From a paper:
IL-2 functions as a lymphocyte growth and stimulatory factor, signaling via activation of the heterodimeric IL-2 receptor complex consisting of two subunits, IL-2 receptor β (CD122) and the common γ receptor subunit (CD132), or the heterotrimeric IL-2 receptor complex that includes IL-2 Rα (CD25). IL-2 activation of the IL-2 Rβγ complex induces proliferative and activation signals through STAT5 phosphorylation that drive effector T and natural killer (NK) cell expansion and tumor clearance. In addition to the IL-2 Rβ and γ subunits, certain cell types express the IL-2 Rα subunit, which functions to increase affinity and capture of IL-2 by the signaling complex. Structures of the IL-2/heterotrimeric receptor signaling complex demonstrated that the IL-2 Rα and βγ subunits engage IL-2 from opposite sides and that the α subunit engages IL-2 independently of the IL-2R βγ interfaces.
The IL-2 compound with residue Pro65 replaced with AzK and pegylated with a 30 kDa mPEG, hereafter referred to as THOR-707, exhibited higher expression levels of the precursor protein and was selected for further characterization. The proline residue at position 65 in human IL-2 appears to impart a significant bend in helix H3, a region that mediates substantial interactions with IL-2 Rα14,15. As the sequence of THOR-707 contains a substitution of this proline to a lysine-like residue, we reasoned that this modification might result in a distinct helical conformation that mis-aligns residues critical for IL-2 Rα engagement. The lysine residue incorporated at position 65 was selected to mimic the effect of the AzK substitution of this position on protein structure, as lysine constitutes the majority of the backbone of the AzK residue without the excessive hydrophobicity of the un-conjugated azide. Surprisingly, the structure of the IL-2 P65K was remarkably similar to that of rhIL-2. Consistent with the above biochemical and ex vivo data, an inspection of the P65K region in the structure shows that this modification occupies a region of the IL-2/IL-2 Rα interface that mediates productive interactions.
Author numbering: 23 to 152
Write the structure that this text describes.
């Protein structure tokens, strides 16, 4: 692979790992607020096959932050503000130069777990196809 491909694969892995960390940290037998967190409704991408589709993740990060404020502080090195800001920086760069592309959402909302599963899968998939 090229150097550009490799650094994109690296940004995507860093994105992956932070999304993974959030999901593991909230979705476990020990989190007494998981039930409450699952009541929130995340918008989902209609299609997520290309880096520009990360726009759909970006637009949900404020919501993600709000839900993460219910999590166990002890499960995260960073405060949710700082973790989400890091994800935001990576997403902004990975999605590419913003055209007239606002992203297209599915009608069905999803729990935080479904939402994070979608984006982790998306990231794993794109790494594999670069």
């Amino acid at each position: 692979t090229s150097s550009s491909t490799k650094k994109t694969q690296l940004q995507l892995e860093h994105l992956l790992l932070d999304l993974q960390m959030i999901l593991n940290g909230i979705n476990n037998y020990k989190n007494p607020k998981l039930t409450r967190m699952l009541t929130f409704k995340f918008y989902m991408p209609k299609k997520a096959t290309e880096l520009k589709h990360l726009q759909c993740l970006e637009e949900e990060l404020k919501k993600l932050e709000e839900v993460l404020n219910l999590a166990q502080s002890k499960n995260f090195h960073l405060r949710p503000r700082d973790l989400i800001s890091n994800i935001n920086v990576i997403v902004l760069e990975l999605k590419g130069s913003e055209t007239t592309f606002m992203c297209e959402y599915a009608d069905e909302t999803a729990t935080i777990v479904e939402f994070l599963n979608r984006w982790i899968t998306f990231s794993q998939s794109i790494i594999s196809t670069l």
